[PDB]
Nucleic acid binder design. Structure first.
Lengths: 188, 149, 50, 224, 77
RNA sequence: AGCUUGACUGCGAGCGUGACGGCGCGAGCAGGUGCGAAAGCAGGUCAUAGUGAUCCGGUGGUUCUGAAUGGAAGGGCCAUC
RNA sequence: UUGAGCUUUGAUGUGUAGGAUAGGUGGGAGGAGCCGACCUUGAAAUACCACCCUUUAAUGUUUGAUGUUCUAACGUUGACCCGUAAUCCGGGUUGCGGACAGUGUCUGGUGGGUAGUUUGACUGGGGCGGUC
RNA sequence: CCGCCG
């Protein structure tokens, strides 16, 4: 049992109400003469996370979650699921397609992508700031006329599509970022 | 149930069986319309002698009257010439009161209720086929020619 | 908290038990202590149970 | 025929008891050589729920001996200590050159917290695709590997997951003492019922048939 | 009122006990329904406001058996 | 560093300390062990924090009771949650 | 007309690569014939058969899910007739609905519409902050 | 497809 009151928690203190885990992003605690205290809390949903805004009173608030965000190593894929390993304790961990969501592209292998595990099971996977990948379906981009940034699109090894310049063809292994999805440079 | 059949019911009985029916089919229909009796320790004794010989035939010879109530008007063709419209589109539709009165006034004295209507209330002048049910299996084909006048 | 509590059950005919604690997620091999059984009045081996 | 009499002694209307056809497993088959027994055990698992996986280590009593070649990933004194524990290639990333060559000479990968940095980093796919890793769930990686492999070379038969209900384990050679095998099938029950995924469905063990290799059928009961 | 003609079922009372054992006076009502019963001797319909178990009684007893019991209790039907 | 399970069961004179519930110390006694050649020490840890009363209920044991009697259920006791 | 289930008789899983016309894995040298593993392999390598996924059809299927037809319960705040000097009620016919609606019991939901209530103490007044 | 100005 770990009960919390709304005048206590600062930021990142993961709470659990209405069947879903919530991260608190920030909370402003106000209380005015001749009123009671309330904390206009800017939360974050954790499973389907867009954002949520709750304005709690001074009492009450929610239980916490078993919510460990430790470093996991992506090492394996099979059917749907994606297996992970700790480089500190070497415990198993199995992620799902609802937990991988919109990031099934960005891992390649041996990546130190962090996950958030909730109540002894992962629901989210965060791939790193950059991954290096290979282009397998890209047109042999010719200049032709083009005076003014040519920018050809490249389909990648992981089934991603990125916009690359006209000097990378196929087997030109290139690194991208995962937070946006842009080409940054080429690994050699 | 305890249903002894006074009559031929068209999907369960053979004029004196002990069919186990739903109770609502016994209260509302089979008991008041002469098709059944409850058999609770007396009516099995009341069917044993006096009904399988006498009252198994008092409906059977009135069903052999259903063979003979049909051929009273053996002509079986009817000319009704009531008020009509103009090139079709009949004035007033002939209902079961006027179809029976076209038969009661000349021929069979059957009532309103045993007149069937396979094709509505006859909104049309023409030759039409009107069924006169007298028995559950014996169906007539008395022709009502709706005529314009 | 982490160090959960187990139940050493006697390997004699009876059901006397000692209860104690063991951190399972550091040393997960079972306890095979040799304790006194007051029903048998002997000193038989005990073994971990829940 | 030769495969027709095999079908003739299978009565699916009766569920057979414990002692009945286990003594008849040499009669239910027409094998040319000496064969073994299998055991089918079914454990209710939803295929889209990863909270219901059952893996572990089943130390097994009594019969078959050292017949499983076991790989070592240890350091320190344990690079020469479990050499007294009977394993063949004791070591390190020498066995990582053999992962890169794809060799089938071992069945088990056992390591230590010294060697927990090798197969978790180098042999990543090829250790769990065919499944041969270790952590804090199976009994694979302690640091007491000397007295670990004094028995796990002998009788351990690895209770492993399947996507559906099935957990098929292995019975021993037919010519042992077969009454003890009815405990070797029974002293897997108390370990499968020892700890599950705390999220079981309706039944624990629905259907159980101990086949020999290809011909025997004996309907086991989950209760008795 | 809400009284069965045949069996004399009038609305009894009782508590509406909740999960926290909060008592609250409710009122159980009988499953009444005005049915239009066929009498073979009278050859007509008698409209009675029977309960649903009052129709069970006329399923066993006669309709004329039950109407004679109403006549003994001063019932106009 | 070796061997090890005394982090043992039944008691416990005598005090210490609390309004009380309670808490603490304890030579010795019986049974059974460990270590040591032995004298001896050992009923957890250098000491002092690491914790919650009852009620209700859960599991194991014990025929102690068991609503005519025979069982059982449910209580009780003991170990515990 | 149908929808998912079982004992059940069996057919049925077609690409990477291995000659291809590989369901999964635990066993893994068996059936005038001829495979198989060994080897070529992939992310997993096949015979033999097991427990079964995933399709197909037969039956006893447990059945529900709806969807027309009918009239006799039921409804009618539709017309007419009678009680009757009565835009109530009752009966009698007829029409239209029709096993729906409605009601009783049990039941999940919603429910400040309404009711009973709770909302700690110390505090150099009390609140706040702190503390137990 | 892209191509701003001295």
């Amino acid at each position: 049992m770990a009960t919390y009151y709304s005048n206590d928690f600062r930021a990142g203190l993961k709470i659990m109400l209405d069947g879903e885990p919530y991260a608190v992003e920030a909370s402003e605690f106000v209380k005015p003469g001749k009123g009671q205290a309330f904390a206009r809390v800017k939360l974050r949903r954790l499973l389907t996370g867009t954002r949520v805004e709750k304005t709690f009173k001074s009492t009450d608030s929610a239980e916490g979650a078993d919510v460990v965000d430790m470093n996991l190593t992506y090492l394996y894929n099979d059917g749907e699921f994606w297996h992970f390993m700790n480089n500190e304790t070497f415990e198993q961990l199995s992620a799902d397609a609802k937990a991988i969501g919109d990031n099934a592209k960005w891992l390649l292998d041996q990546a130190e992508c962090i996950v958030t595990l909730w109540n002894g099971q992962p629901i989210s996977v965060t791939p790193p700031n950059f991954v290096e990948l290979e282009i397998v379906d890209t047109d042999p981009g010719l200049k032709g006329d083009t005076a003014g940034t040519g920018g050809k699109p490249a389909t990648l090894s992981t089934g991603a599509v990125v916009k690359v310049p006209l000097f990378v063809q196929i087997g030109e292994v290139i690194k991208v970022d995962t937070r946006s999805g842009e080409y940054v440079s080429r690994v050699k | 149930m305890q249903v002894i059949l006074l009559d031929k019911v068209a999907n369960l009985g053979s004029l004196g069986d002990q069919v186990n029916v739903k109770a609502g089919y016994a209260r509302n229909f089979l008991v008041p319309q002469g098709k059944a009796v409850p058999a609770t320790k007396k009516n099995i004794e009341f069917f044993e002698a006096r009904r399988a010989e006498l009252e198994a035939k008092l409906a059977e010879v009135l069903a052999a009257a259903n063979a003979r109530a049909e051929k009273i008007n053996a002509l079986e063709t009817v000319t009704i010439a009531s008020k009509a419209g103009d090139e079709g589109k009949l004035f007033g539709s002939i209902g079961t009161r006027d179809i029976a009165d076209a038969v009661t006034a000349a021929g069979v004295e059957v009532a309103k209720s045993e007149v069937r209507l396979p094709n509505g209330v006859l909104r049309t002048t023409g030759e039409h086929e009107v069924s006169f049910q007298v028995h559950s299996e014996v169906f007539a084909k008395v022709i009502v020619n709706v005529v314009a006048e | 908290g982490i160090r959960e509590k187990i139940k050493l059950v006697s390997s004699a005919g009876t059901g006397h038990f000692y209860t104690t604690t063991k951190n399972k997620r550091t040393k997960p091999e079972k306890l095979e202590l040799k304790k006194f059984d007051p029903v048998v009045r002997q000193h038989v081996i005990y073994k971990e149970a829940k | 025929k030769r495969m027709r009499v095999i079908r003739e002694k299978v009565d699916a209307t009766k569920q057979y008891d414990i002692n009945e056809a286990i003594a008849l497993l040499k009669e239910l088959a027409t094998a040319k050589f000496v064969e073994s027994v299998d055991v089918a055990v079914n454990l209710g698992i939803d295929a889209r729920k990863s909270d219901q996986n059952v893996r572990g280590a089943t130390v097994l009593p009594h019969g078959t001996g050292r017949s499983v070649r076991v790989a070592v990933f240890t350091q320190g004194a344990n690079a020469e200590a479990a050499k007294a524990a009977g394993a063949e290639l004791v070591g390190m990333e020498d066995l990582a050159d053999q992962i890169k060559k794809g060799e089938m000479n071992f069945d088990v990968v056992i390591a230590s917290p010294d060697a927990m940095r090798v197969v978790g980093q180098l042999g990543q796919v090829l250790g769990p695709r065919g499944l041969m890793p270790n952590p804090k769930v199976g009994t694979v990686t302690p640091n007491v590997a000397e007295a670990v492999k004094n028995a796990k070379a002998g009788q351990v038969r690895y209770r492993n997951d399947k996507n559906g209900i099935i957990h098929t384990t292995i019975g021993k050679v037919d010519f042992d003492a077969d009454k003890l095998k009815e405990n070797l099938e029974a002293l897997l029950v108390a370990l499968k019922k020892a700890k599950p995924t705390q999220a079981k469905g309706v039944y624990i063990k629905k259907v159980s048939i101990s086949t020999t290799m290809g011909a025997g059928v004996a309907v086991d009961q989950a209760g008795l | 009122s809400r009284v069965c003609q045949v069996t004399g079922k009038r609305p009894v009372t009782g508590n509406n006990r909740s999960h926290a054992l909060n008592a609250t006076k409710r009122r159980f009502l009988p499953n009444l329904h005005s049915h239009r019963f066929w009498v073979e001797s009278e050859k007509r319909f008698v409209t009675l406001r029977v309960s649903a178990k009052g129709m069970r009684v006329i399923d066993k007893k006669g309709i004329d058996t039950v109407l004679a019991e109403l006549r003994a209790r001063g019932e106009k039907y």
